[PDB]
């Protein structure tokens, strides 16, 4: 079960250096012993090996410089979880400390002097080209500009923000996954020996990295707010790291014309793994050119820095705020539907959030979570998960072909997940969760059976003080059965699950102090999409479709969208008095 991992993007691979990640409860002594063992084993095979770093505090393992010939031997080692080949990363009131993993910084620049601390942590790869020389250059530019965007006196977002610099990107703005990993370990060791809310800005990106995402998840679980650039490759950000880590706040870049940023032939990364977008074109900030100089830059780094700033401001006001609460407020205070989605590839539009970060001017906050596409297999499933602190209040599904078996809100590892099931002959499906933060919530999913008899049809939260937040429907007839057109369960009251008689129904029932929910609906006879929205003050919790004819239904902020090929959109709107 010991696996080997390498970058998908061949030019970004760095063979010879490997990250050996050991099993969960492996202690420091066991990492050292395993490293000494690898070295001794290699030496017997007549190979020189060098242990560069022994990871502890963040994840268990070590960093090793060795021939790839020795991989097969290192996978046979005890306690080994997996081995990941190192690869390149590229440059893109209370005291809140903001860590910056980037290039060097001009700490004496008037814009950021006395607010920026240089940690002395430096871990960078050597520059490409046998005759490369920095010369009059201080390899300051990027980092200096980004500290300016975050905390700069005249052009900064969070002017009252303490910052700490870690040199992780060389003169050519290049770093390694291994160097970043060491940087992150330094941040965790720092917070272990120190008190204070933390924000970590990672304005860099490389190809999907299992270990980078793992280290990022570990830090996030330790209550650290990690903000990252989505990537400047006009591509699915899920293919990139730390971009792909769900725990990190992933930021895409937009220009003044509310358009996604174009960077030459490429531009801002898009899709599912992008949490939100922020100003990222022609961004004025400090210039390493002089102590009083400015420069306008572009890229998802600039955009990430804005969010790191907004995070710092929110945390200076309420330092106790959780990463869940912060992400929900970040989404909440954003500008909705401003972005022109035309620039993104058609199939990625649905998955790309239409939010631009903005500062804020007993609440129920919700966010939509899109799953990855399932396979084309008839038994294939898609799964959308919430954050540990959140509640799965609703679960929907969407297929481009419309061949769907429906969806389920099922517990998986003691936590409710939104699982969507593909159908016989279907392209594949997406699972769309609605992840919420509801104050003193006691929530449960009750499962109702298919109802083909006359009566027993009405699925609702029959419990006193328990209110319906959302409904899921799963088609209960097997593929080798006899297909008959699905019949709808009659409607009596509004506050009941809309569904087919032949389907099982999963009802989310929440009990909370001042929770009140309502059902809104809107139908059109011959549409491509039907829509219904929750009023100002109300939060969309559930989104469902009344009528195969329908491709699916999904939440788009406080709007329930039903996509068709009368078509009704059924929404549950909640609020907390």
């Amino acid at each position: 079960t010991a696996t080997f991992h390498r970058c998908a993007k061949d030019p970004w691979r760095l063979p010879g250096t490997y990250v050996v990640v050991l099993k969960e409860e492996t202690h420091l002594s066991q990492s050292e012993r395993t490293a000494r063992r690898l070295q001794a084993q290699a030496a017997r095979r007549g190979y020189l090996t060098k242990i560069l770093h022994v990871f502890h505090g963040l994840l268990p393992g070590f960093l090793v410089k060795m021939s790839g010939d020795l991989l097969e031997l290192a996978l046979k080692l005890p306690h080994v979880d997996y081995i990941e080949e190192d690869s390149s990363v590229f440059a893109q009131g209370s005291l809140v400390e903001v860590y910056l993993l980037d290039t060097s910084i001009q700490s004496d620049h008037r814009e950021i002097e006395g607010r920026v601390m240089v940690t002395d942590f430096e871990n960078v790869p050597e520059e490409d080209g046998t005759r490369f020389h920095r010369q009059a250059s201080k390899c300051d530019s990027h980092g200096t500009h980004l500290a300016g965007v975050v905390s700069g006196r005249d052009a900064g977002v969070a002017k009252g923000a303490s910052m700490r610099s870690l040199r992780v990107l060389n003169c050519q703005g290049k770093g390694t996954v291994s160097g970043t990993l060491i940087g992150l370990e330094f941040i965790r060791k720092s917070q272990l020996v120190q008190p204070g809310p933390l924000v970590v800005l990672l304005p860099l990106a490389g190809g999907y990295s299992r270990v980078l995402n793992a280290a990022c998840q570990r830090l996030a679980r330790a209550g650290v707010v990690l903000v990252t650039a989505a990537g400047n490759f006009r591509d699915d950000a899920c293919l990139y790291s730390p971009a792909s880590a769900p725990e990190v706040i992933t930021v895409g870049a937009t220009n003044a014309q509310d358009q996604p940023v174009t960077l030459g032939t490429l531009g801002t990364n898009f899709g599912r793994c992008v949490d939100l977008f922020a100003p990222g074109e022609d961004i004025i900030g400090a210039s390493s050119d002089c102590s009083t100089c400015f420069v306008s830059q572009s890229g998802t780094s600039q955009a990430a820095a804005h969010v790191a700033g907004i995070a710092a401001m929110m945390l200076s006001a309420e330092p106790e705020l959780t990463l869940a609460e912060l992400r929900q407020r970040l989404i909440h205070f954003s500008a909705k539907d401003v972005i022109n989605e035309a620039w993104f590839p058609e199939d990625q539009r649905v998955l790309t959030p239409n939010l631009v970060a903005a500062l804020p001017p007993w609440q129920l906050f919700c966010r939509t979570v899109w799953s990855a596409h399932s396979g084309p297999t008839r038994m294939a499933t898609a799964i959308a998960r919430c954050a540990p602190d959140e509640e799965l209040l609703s679960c929907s599904s969407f297929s481009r072909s419309g061949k769907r078996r429906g969806e389920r809100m099922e517990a998986q590892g003691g936590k409710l997940v939104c699982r969507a099931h593909n159908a016989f002959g279907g392209e594949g499906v997406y699972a769309i969760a609605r992840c919420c933060l509801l104050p003193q919530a006691n929530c449960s999913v009750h499962t109702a059976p298919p109802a083909e008899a006359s009566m027993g049809t009405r699925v609702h939260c029959h419990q006193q003080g328990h209110v319906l937040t959302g409904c899921s429907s799963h088609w209960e007839v097997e593929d080798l059965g006899t297909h008959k057109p699905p019949v709808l369960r009659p409607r009596g009251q509004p506050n009941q699950c809309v569904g087919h008689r032949e389907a099982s129904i999963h009802a989310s029932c929440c009990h909370a102090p001042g929770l009140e929910c309502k059902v809104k609906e809107h139908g059109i006879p011959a549409p491509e999409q039907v829509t219904v929205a929750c009023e100002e003050g109300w939060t969309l919790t559930g989104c469902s479709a009344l009528p195969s004819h329908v491709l699916g239904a999904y939440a788009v902020d406080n709007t329930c969208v039903v996509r068709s090929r009368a078509v009704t959109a059924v929404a549950i709107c909640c609020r907390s008095r």
Partner: antibody
Framework: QVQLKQSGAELVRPGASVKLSCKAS????????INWLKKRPGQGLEWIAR????????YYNENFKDKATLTAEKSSSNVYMQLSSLTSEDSAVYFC?????????????????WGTGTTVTVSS | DIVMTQSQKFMSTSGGDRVSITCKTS??????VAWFQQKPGQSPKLLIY???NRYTGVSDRFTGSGSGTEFIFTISYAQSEDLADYFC?????????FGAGTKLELKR
């Protein structure tokens, strides 16, 4: 006169299969859901699956999906439950039961009539 | 899956006239709890439905109470004729889950 007659006790070799029967009478067969329930000596009843005769559509407990198969014969007026690849863990008393609905709510029903059970002995 | 935790013995109260059993649920099932009598080699008999409603023919000596996660089943003036196993079940969520059963014991 509303009743559910269950088949006789069965002895099955481990790895074999059994088709249990539940003869319904004194009511409209195709209009009421019928359920299968497992009872082990010290344990509480386990809900296996339900079938609506009339459509023959089934809903199972995930835990019994591969084990059990429900079927209905309108002519014979009886529901069947087939249990595949038996084990000593399947030696139990199987009970048959009708759901009688009194309202539109999914909780406006009860198990008014039951069969006396069929004893299954999985042994060589 | 909702967990049903039924009391192992009947609890005597007012001079042995009322004997009771509690049935506690893993999650709030509202009032969706039924109570059955089971005499050995016989089909279970519905006594209380919807936590407190008494099925047809059922004696006024059988009572049910409770809502949410705690439900009581009581037998006033228990007779030798009432010696059987008693069990509860929730019907708020599928898969349906049942209590282990409690055998009535009587002093004499």
């Amino acid at each position: 006169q509303v009743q559910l007659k269950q088949s006789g006790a069965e002895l099955v070799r481990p790895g074999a299969s059994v088709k249990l029967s539940c003869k319904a009478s004194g009511y409209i067969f195709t209009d009421y859901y019928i359920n299968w329930l497992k009872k082990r000596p010290g344990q509480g009843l386990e809900w296996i699956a339900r079938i609506y005769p009339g459509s023959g559509h089934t809903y199972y407990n995930e835990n019994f999906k591969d084990k059990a198969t429900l079927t209905a014969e309108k002519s014979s007026s009886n529901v069947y439950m087939q249990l595949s690849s038996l084990t000593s863990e399947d030696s139990a008393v199987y009970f048959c039961a009708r759901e009688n609905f009194y309202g539109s709510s999914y909780v406006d029903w009860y198990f008014d009539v039951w069969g006396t059970g069929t004893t299954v002995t999985v042994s060589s | 899956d909702i967990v049903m935790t039924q009391s192992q013995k009947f609890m005597s109260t007012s001079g042995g006239d009322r004997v009771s059993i509690t049935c506690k649920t893993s999650q709030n099932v509202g009032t969706a709890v039924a109570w059955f009598q089971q005499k050995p080699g016989q089909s279970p008999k519905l006594l209380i439905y919807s936590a407190s409603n008494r099925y047809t023919g059922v004696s006024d000596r059988f009572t049910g109470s409770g809502s949410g996660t705690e439900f009581i089943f009581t037998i006033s003036y228990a007779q030798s004729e009432d010696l059987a196993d008693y069990f509860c079940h929730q019907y708020s969520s599928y898969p349906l889950t049942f209590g282990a059963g409690t055998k009535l014991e009587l002093k004499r």
